[model samples]
Target: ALTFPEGFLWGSATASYQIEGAAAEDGRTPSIWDTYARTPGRVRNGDTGDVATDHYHRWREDVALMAELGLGAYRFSLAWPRIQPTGRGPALQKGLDFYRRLADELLAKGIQPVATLYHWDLPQELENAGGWPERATAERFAEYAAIAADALGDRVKTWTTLNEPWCSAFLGYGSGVHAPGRTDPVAALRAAHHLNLGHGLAVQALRDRLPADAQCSVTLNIHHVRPLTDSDADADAVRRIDALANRVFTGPMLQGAYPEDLVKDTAGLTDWSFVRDGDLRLAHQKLDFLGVNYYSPTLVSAHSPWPGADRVAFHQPPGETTAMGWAVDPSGLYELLRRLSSDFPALPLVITENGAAFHDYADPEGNVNDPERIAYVRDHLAAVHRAIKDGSDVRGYFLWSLLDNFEWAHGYSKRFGAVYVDYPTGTRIPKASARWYAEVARTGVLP
Candidate 1:
């Protein structure tokens, strides 16, 4: 058995658009995801989150479920459009009230409420106005953060400013795979800078309204990039991808400057004129902890989502894979923690999102037995334990999801939740993985 530190936080996470499916209720307007899902062929099977898990109306049940599972915390996102329908002025009371109630419920059940201000659900209005690429969008994000903090600041002490800006910037703008998709490498670079700016400004806004004890942080899916082979070109390719995947945000946010290599490499694409004076300073605010979301490592060779890394190719090392086709590599999580601890020695860390999607279905016995998920989580937990033992300063672990909900782009085709969600009736079934995880959370030991 592997025992975690006493008081180690155990929780599960979900995004606003992925779970809370009241698309048009309570003054909540369209987010980029809503618009993207509605657009033909944007998401798989043309599925939208219009009625996702129905968490909006059934949150009481969800909270009860968390209590039943003995979860120590719940990491959830605040829908930007829900709070500020237009992404600009005052927040809608009805929208804030929903989160307020949810937080209140979680706290009542002895569950810590960790609120993420943004989880890639940019309000459609903001997207229409050039999205994250535009400087004004960062300003709008700050205003929205202030609104959320004003309403939930006293109750939700753990606040995360942004979740995975890389996906929001690169995937959304450069690769054109995510919401408000547009394939412009220059736009991706600009969006990356603005997302960093927004994170810093939002942190400032949160600090202003939140109580002194409130913890402020950001969640980044920092890529654990590796070279496919021991070759100079392969190593250089690794550097290029690292610059784009990890350092682009970490450099500015953590070190107060973009990596020189990154700037030099992308010089052909854009001059980075969008990064104005004092922007890095704004993005370099001190954070209490850093949230890391890891699933697998990235292997690349010199042969590439990157702007100037056209010759770089990605390779998937042969291994077990999740239904999403992502390689199941817990070693990546351990190595990532080690790297972050080495690079940012002063920062504490938390596993904000980690888990895999699998093909899940209920048997006639009304049981969903997902041993693969249990194995995945167990191996990952062992990795986390190793990282902690090696002095990584990891403080907590929050699984990727609590319930099977809308997986972006893949839609409901993927299931990454411990609890099974029967989409039709919204009935919740605690899968074997859920039970296994509950015992782990209860005992603080991985057996």
Candidate 2:
């Protein structure tokens, strides 16, 4: 019987590259994701987002579906490649037009439109010019943010500058697991600073363009880090992993300076020479709110990666795992929310993305009965409700996706959406979890 706050928002999220197919339509160009998915041996099964769910052509239908689902807010990202094909140009009217239409439809249905400017779909041309590691890319992102703000600012009240930049910096450059895959620890550190720089610049750009009441935020998939034991070695391991996984961005974004420990830990990675004078100042703008995307908790023990983090090993506590192999631990969400509230007491927060991937399928009766997903979402939202009750100002909860679409390197295999998609036919069927979530949205209580 967990009831949410009176105005707690409920919605679903989707990335442009992940959901909106039409990869080469209406003056759109290739993004790094386009290149990554097409490269041989990169995406599993060589799956590409060339026609992911055909959302570009069917956005109206999806918006209608959102209405049917009783969504209070809709959070989605703009494709930099779609909007600024070459990552440098005047606005692409058609790309802007699509978002305009989406916002209008959402508004017509009484749903707030929350827009994110970037979600890893870096324009291919930008990556060709050095991507996030180069300072130029930070400035370029500011320009893109301004363009998007000018186009959608009037109708969209909440604008997020970037989503899960940790993945963009570390996974992309440090481990070479994501787009523009590069395996250089130094470049990873460099990309992180630039990402922080870009977020601040984009926030500034949005403030200049959006109305006073508009809220601007940046989303980070902040890890709910925990140590495996009380041993001194495990505590140190936790500290190192926390510095890299969580505080690297939080320090500069919220505290206005990189953690001294972060700099000291990764000293051998690079001189951090890429972070110029006043860069930290530029990354420390006032944010309207912080968006935290939580999936699972990270358990670490003393063991290797990064530079001084040569003895930290990340682990998952024993629990049921999602299709993505992430442990099911709703307590992590509660822990993460309490942590943010404690660390940044004055700042408001939103659970911008919280959902799970599952082995979902339509039954012989054409019903997608996903009890596991329902439990995953139910427990997480319960955690969020508890957080709010305990004095954390968590304003909203958006499921990870609205429809099953292209899932980055995982391609179409992993389904994180409430609405099940028949990928071959581009059909969408709301799962049982969708109905459960809709009830939560409509009644402001868990059923």
Alpha carbon lDDT of each predicted model: 0.93, 0.90
Query: lDDT by residue for model 2 over 331-399, one digit each (tens)?
Result: 999989999999999999999999999989999999999999999999888888899999999989889
Q: Stretches of candidate 1 above 4 Å error?
A: 302-304
- The number of the candidate with the highest TM-score is 1
Give TM per candidate.
0.99, 0.98
Candidate 2 at 191: error in angstroms?
0.5
Question: What TM-score does structure 2 among the candidates reach?
Answer: 0.98
Worst 10 residues of 1 by lDDT: 302-311
lDDT of 1: 0.93
Residue-pair clashes per prediction, in order, are 1, 1
RMSD of each: 1.4, 1.5
